[PDB]
Write an enzyme that holds these catalytic residues in place. Structure first.
Site, PDB file in Angstrom:
ATOM      1  N   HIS A  12       0.779  -1.279   0.000  1.00 15.41           N
ATOM      2  CA  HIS A  12       0.000   0.000   0.000  1.00 15.41           C
ATOM      3  C   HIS A  12       0.792   1.301   0.000  1.00 15.41           C
ATOM      4  O   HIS A  12       0.186   2.376   0.094  1.00 15.41           O
ATOM      5  CB  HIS A  12      -1.001   0.023   1.155  1.00 15.41           C
ATOM      6  CG  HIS A  12      -2.007  -1.080   1.114  1.00 15.41           C
ATOM      7  ND1 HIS A  12      -2.889  -1.270   0.072  1.00 15.41           N
ATOM      8  CD2 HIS A  12      -2.261  -2.087   1.991  1.00 15.41           C
ATOM      9  CE1 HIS A  12      -3.656  -2.318   0.324  1.00 15.41           C
ATOM     10  NE2 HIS A  12      -3.254  -2.864   1.455  1.00 15.41           N
ATOM     11  N   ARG A  20       1.078   7.115 -12.546  1.00 13.16           N
ATOM     12  CA  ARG A  20      -0.219   6.878 -11.874  1.00 13.16           C
ATOM     13  C   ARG A  20      -1.366   6.521 -12.814  1.00 13.16           C
ATOM     14  O   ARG A  20      -2.546   6.740 -12.521  1.00 13.16           O
ATOM     15  CB  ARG A  20      -0.581   8.031 -10.980  1.00 13.16           C
ATOM     16  CG  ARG A  20       0.383   8.172  -9.842  1.00 13.16           C
ATOM     17  CD  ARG A  20       0.081   9.412  -9.074  1.00 13.16           C
ATOM     18  NE  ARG A  20      -1.166   9.355  -8.309  1.00 13.16           N
ATOM     19  CZ  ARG A  20      -1.664  10.413  -7.683  1.00 13.16           C
ATOM     20  NH1 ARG A  20      -1.063  11.598  -7.780  1.00 13.16           N
ATOM     21  NH2 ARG A  20      -2.773  10.301  -6.939  1.00 13.16           N
ATOM     22  N   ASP A  21      -0.997   5.848 -13.895  1.00 10.21           N
ATOM     23  CA  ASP A  21      -1.896   5.425 -14.972  1.00 10.21           C
ATOM     24  C   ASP A  21      -1.956   3.891 -15.053  1.00 10.21           C
ATOM     25  O   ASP A  21      -1.402   3.197 -14.192  1.00 10.21           O
ATOM     26  CB  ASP A  21      -1.433   6.044 -16.306  1.00 10.21           C
ATOM     27  CG  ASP A  21      -0.011   5.640 -16.709  1.00 10.21           C
ATOM     28  OD1 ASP A  21       0.718   4.945 -15.944  1.00 10.21           O
ATOM     29  OD2 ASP A  21       0.408   6.033 -17.823  1.00 10.21           O
ATOM     30  N   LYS A  39      -4.572  -9.761  -7.860  1.00 10.28           N
ATOM     31  CA  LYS A  39      -5.475  -9.131  -6.879  1.00 10.28           C
ATOM     32  C   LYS A  39      -6.508  -8.241  -7.570  1.00 10.28           C
ATOM     33  O   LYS A  39      -6.163  -7.490  -8.480  1.00 10.28           O
ATOM     34  CB  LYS A  39      -4.646  -8.331  -5.886  1.00 10.28           C
ATOM     35  CG  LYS A  39      -5.431  -7.796  -4.728  1.00 10.28           C
ATOM     36  CD  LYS A  39      -4.512  -7.242  -3.661  1.00 10.28           C
ATOM     37  CE  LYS A  39      -5.304  -6.918  -2.425  1.00 10.28           C
ATOM     38  NZ  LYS A  39      -4.605  -5.987  -1.516  1.00 10.28           N
ATOM     39  N   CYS A  80      -5.768   0.525  -8.276  1.00 11.87           N
ATOM     40  CA  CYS A  80      -5.567  -0.325  -9.427  1.00 11.87           C
ATOM     41  C   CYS A  80      -6.681  -1.345  -9.382  1.00 11.87           C
ATOM     42  O   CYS A  80      -6.801  -2.089  -8.419  1.00 11.87           O
ATOM     43  CB  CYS A  80      -4.212  -1.043  -9.293  1.00 11.87           C
ATOM     44  SG  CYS A  80      -2.823   0.152  -9.240  1.00 11.87           S
ATOM     45  N   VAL A 102      -7.515   8.359   4.200  1.00 13.03           N
ATOM     46  CA  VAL A 102      -7.150   6.931   4.255  1.00 13.03           C
ATOM     47  C   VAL A 102      -7.607   6.313   5.575  1.00 13.03           C
ATOM     48  O   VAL A 102      -7.441   6.948   6.633  1.00 13.03           O
ATOM     49  CB  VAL A 102      -5.628   6.802   4.102  1.00 13.03           C
ATOM     50  CG1 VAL A 102      -5.089   5.401   4.466  1.00 13.03           C
ATOM     51  CG2 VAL A 102      -5.222   7.284   2.694  1.00 13.03           C
ATOM     52  N   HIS A 113      -3.098  -2.544   8.057  1.00  7.99           N
ATOM     53  CA  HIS A 113      -4.212  -2.926   7.226  1.00  7.99           C
ATOM     54  C   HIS A 113      -4.801  -1.684   6.608  1.00  7.99           C
ATOM     55  O   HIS A 113      -5.037  -0.713   7.313  1.00  7.99           O
ATOM     56  CB  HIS A 113      -5.279  -3.585   8.115  1.00  7.99           C
ATOM     57  CG  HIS A 113      -6.616  -3.787   7.475  1.00  7.99           C
ATOM     58  ND1 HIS A 113      -6.807  -4.603   6.389  1.00  7.99           N
ATOM     59  CD2 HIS A 113      -7.843  -3.320   7.813  1.00  7.99           C
ATOM     60  CE1 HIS A 113      -8.085  -4.608   6.057  1.00  7.99           C
ATOM     61  NE2 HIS A 113      -8.736  -3.828   6.901  1.00  7.99           N
TER      62      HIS A 113
END
Length: 122
Positions: A12, A20-21, A39, A80, A102, A113
């Site tokens: 993370h 960032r694409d 994932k 993503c 966040v 987590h």
């Protein structure tokens, strides 16, 4: 030990991304070991690592929902999302960049987590 915090950073945290694409997502998901198998959704937080850790303290966090913590500050994030209906590679992703609060769970003053569900929309 430090292991669950290190897991959190691996899944993370990416301090200074270029892009960032979609191509960024496809590469970083593979580098971080999240493509064997793929994932379905995963969010990376950018910027200052210590501001993330501070969510676990009153400096940059508050209690949230059932025993989670929400950041006071907002962060640059990239989510993503896996394309298509297979769990197996190739793992094609679509990126969604944002500036968001966040939500984490903390253990021993360290984030371990991410509450990944909040990033499902938009």
């Amino acid at each position: 030990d430090n292991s669950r915090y290190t897991h959190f950073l691996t899944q993370h945290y990416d301090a200074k991304p270029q892009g960032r694409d979609d191509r960024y997502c496809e590469s970083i998901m593979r580098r971080r070991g999240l493509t064997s198998p793929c994932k379905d959704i995963n969010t990376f937080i950018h910027g200052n690592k210590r501001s993330i850790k501070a969510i676990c303290e009153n400096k940059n966090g508050n209690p949230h929902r059932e025993n989670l913590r929400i950041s006071k500050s907002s962060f640059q994030v990239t989510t993503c999302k896996l394309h298509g209906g297979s769990p197996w590679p190739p793992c094609q992703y679509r990126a969604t960049a944002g500036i968001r609060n966040v939500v984490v769970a903390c253990e021993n003053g360290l984030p371990v987590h991410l509450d990944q569900s909040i990033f499902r929309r938009p």
